[PDB]
Design a binder for this molecule. Structure first.
Ligand SMILES: C[C@H](CCC(=O)NCCC[N+](C)(C)CCCS(=O)(=O)[O-])[C@H]1CC[C@H]2[C@@H]3[C@H](O)C[C@@H]4C[C@H](O)CC[C@]4(C)[C@H]3C[C@H](O)[C@]12C
Ligand SMILES: C[C@]12CC[C@H]3[C@@H](CCC4=CC(=O)CC[C@@]43C)[C@@H]1CC[C@@H]2C(=O)CO
Length: 248
């Protein structure tokens, strides 16, 4: 038989981005958030590259490709970050990158404190659930495929199939470990529930994101160029209520 989606997914998994951050410079809500954004630009590149590698994704109309990316990019980055914070700090600290890890001081200095907390609860779940790589890779894959424009998609049928497949491979991945039916079931539930709770958080995140974006010169937070492009193109569709979370 052919190499599984997970085999491919483990292969196309992006390397960890460094922020470029200076940790000697003091913790100032403007410096922090500017720095975060630089990173989001660094990640956005790795994410899109990632999505192009992602089996079936190239087979969607370019309209859909860019839209999905436009909607899911925030959740993708927050989730991967939930994952990293789990592996590297076991949920205690927010591990944006090896050179830019938030602790308590910096979550406070962030002026997003309640959102940090939320992202943390996400990593803490990763921890509670002892999520595995393979569950993670498939979850993240589904996370992309979990916020679609309400007016439908060019490639609709092909997408629904992809979604199907990534649920199927999330199933292959929970099934490893044995347990049989019932345990599996609760698992599937918990994971997908974790996925579904993602939208919630992304909500607050986009919200504060836009907020910070509009008021950028007001707040002295430096959004880089690719970041300008993407947030901008996302913003009006999002407000319009074009984007609709797919749930379980
Ligand atoms: C109807 C509600 C739901 C979400 C709301 C928006 C969000 O708050 C984010 C955004 C922050 C900026 O600062 C300027 C205000 C802006 C555009 C809000 C305007 C408006 O009230 C919206 C569309
Ligand atoms: C976009 C954002 C800065 C960048 C991060 C995001 C939260 C999660 C996140 C994960 C990453 O590992 C990279 C950057 C990023 C996407 C923040 C949510 C609010 C904050 C701002 O709105 C300030 O720009």
């Amino acid at each position: 038989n052919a190499p599984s989606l997970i085999s491919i997914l483990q292969a196309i998994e992006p390397e960890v981005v460094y922020a470029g951050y200076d940790n000697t410079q003091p913790d100032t809500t403007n410096y922090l958030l500017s720095s975060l954004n630089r990173l989001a630009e660094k990640q956005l590149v790795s994410v899109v590259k990632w999505a192009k590698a992602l089996p079936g994704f190239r087979n969607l109309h370019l309209d859909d490709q860019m839209t999905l990316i436009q909607y899911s990019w925030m959740g993708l980055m927050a989730f991967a970050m939930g994952w990293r914070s789990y592996k590297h700090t076991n949920g205690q600290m927010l591990y944006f990158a090896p050179d830019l890890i938030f602790n308590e001081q910096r979550m406070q200095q962030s002026a997003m404190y309640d959102l940090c907390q939320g992202m943390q609860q996400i990593s803490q779940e990763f921890v509670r659930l002892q999520v595995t790589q393979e569950e993670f890779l498939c979850m993240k894959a589904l996370l992309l495929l979990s916020t679609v424009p309400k007016e439908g998609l060019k490639s609709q049928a092909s997408f629904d199939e992809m979604r199907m497949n990534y649920i199927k491979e999330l199933n292959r991945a929970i099934a490893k470990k044995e347990n049989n039916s019932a345990q599996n079931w609760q698992r599937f539930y918990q994971l997908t529930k974790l996925l579904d709770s993602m939208h919630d958080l992304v909500g607050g995140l986009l919200q504060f994101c836009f907020y910070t974006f509009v008021q950028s010169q007001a707040l002295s937070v430096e959004f880089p160029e690719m970041l300008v492009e993407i947030i901008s193109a996302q913003l009006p569709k999002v407000l319009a209520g074009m984007a609709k979370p797919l749930l379980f």
